[PDB]
Design a binder for this molecule. Structure first.
Ligand SMILES: COc1cccc(Nc2ncc(-c3ccc(C(=O)NCC(=O)Nc4ccccc4)cc3)c(OCC3CCNCC3)n2)c1
Length: 311
């Protein structure tokens, strides 16, 4: 009953992970691989309106460093979200496999995180759960931001001091702190604040003191100081991160945060390829795609666009 409608469009493969369950699947019409997030409506209970909030936010996010939503299917018992499959896995596992990244490789990945987070802020949202388990590598080894635990709104080791304390906060300021923890982990391969006891970890985060390894450059140390300020008002703004001297080193252009993935411009080749599968004319097809209902038509159009981009 629950998988019947989904199986009209996708061939299901194995479970990837569990939190929600995620399955690898293949979109039948295009042959493109997708990740399907499966949520039980009864299990969610009082949390169900929050899932509807995440979905509406993702529908408003379309960006080169954000995992793409293709299709939302709701049945009597489940909500299925069909998403971009990132075959490279988690940044969390990548850092561990490499031990730590050089300053140069850290900058390659950090500029992608900055691009995604600045865009999220430009759209009027805050992520609030930035961490390496929420950053995945796509087939081109580029990063895609996800939010697996429904924190984004219009994990303790990465949480800002004010967020933990239950004080009022600005999501953008909490994101900058979390980005500072990510910058440290990328270059060190361990957390700046860590403890086996939750209370002692809480004390360490509130204090804001951390070891500075000998391999960190003076410029890296300065950027870390600018992001990891216990006082949220003393933290660097996102605007100043885009063209920060450390960020610009070896690039000489600020982070390109604007989206390259449009809602308005339709790709003529993909509209043509999609139109052959429907009994309607081309203009009726274009009008329907432009409604962005996140039904099978939306999924087919976006997957054809991904298939085109590979070529
Ligand atoms: C090959 O080995 C591997 C190994 C690991 C992963 C993969 N691949 C792979 N690709 C795709 C997924 C996926 C993407 C998005 C969402 C999601 O929930 N989006 C919602 C969302 O992104 N909102 C949002 C984004 C930005 C701003 C605001 C809101 C859920 C799942 C996946 O999941 C597996 C989980 C397992 C638990 N840790 C996290 C990943 N895995 C592959």
């Amino acid at each position: 009953m629950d998988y019947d409608e989904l199986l009209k469009y996708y061939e299901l493969h194995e479970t990837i992970g569990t939190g929600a369950k995620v399955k690898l699947a293949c979109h039948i019409l295009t042959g493109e691989m997708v990740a399907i997030k499966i949520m039980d409506k009864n299990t969610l209970g009082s949390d169900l309106p929050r899932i509807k909030t995440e979905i509406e936010a993702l529908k408003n996010l379309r960006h080169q460093h954000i995992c793409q939503l293709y299709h939302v299917l709701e049945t009597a018992n489940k909500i299925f979200m069909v998403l971009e499959y990132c075959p490279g896995g988690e940044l969390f596992d990548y850092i561990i496999s490499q031990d730590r990244l050089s300053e140069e490789e850290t900058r390659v990945v950090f500029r992608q995180i900055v691009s995604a987070v600045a865009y999220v802020h430009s759209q009027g949202y805050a992520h609030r759960d930035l961490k390496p388990e929420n950053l995945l590598f796509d087939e081109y080894h580029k990063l895609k931001l996800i939010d697996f635990g429904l924190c984004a709104k219009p994990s303790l080791a990465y949480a800002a001091p004010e967020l933990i304390q239950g004080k009022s906060y600005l999501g953008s300021e909490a994101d900058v702190w979390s980005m500072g923890i990510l910058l440290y982990v990328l270059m060190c391969g361990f957390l700046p604040f860590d403890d086996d006891n939750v209370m002692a970890l809480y004390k360490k985060i509130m204090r804001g003191k951390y070891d500075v390894p000998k391999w960190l450059s003076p410029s890296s140390i300065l950027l870390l100081q600018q992001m990891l300020q216990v006082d949220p008002k003393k933290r660097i703004s996102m605007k100043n991160l885009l063209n920060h001297p450390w960020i610009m080193q070896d690039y000489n252009y600020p982070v390109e945060w604007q989206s390259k993935n449009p809602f308005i411009h339709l790709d003529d080749d993909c509209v043509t390829e999609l139109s052959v599968h429907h009994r309607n004319n081309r203009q009726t097809m274009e009008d329907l795609i432009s409604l962005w209902q996140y039904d099978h038509l939306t999924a087919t159009y976006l997957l054809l666009l991904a298939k085109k981009a590979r070529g």
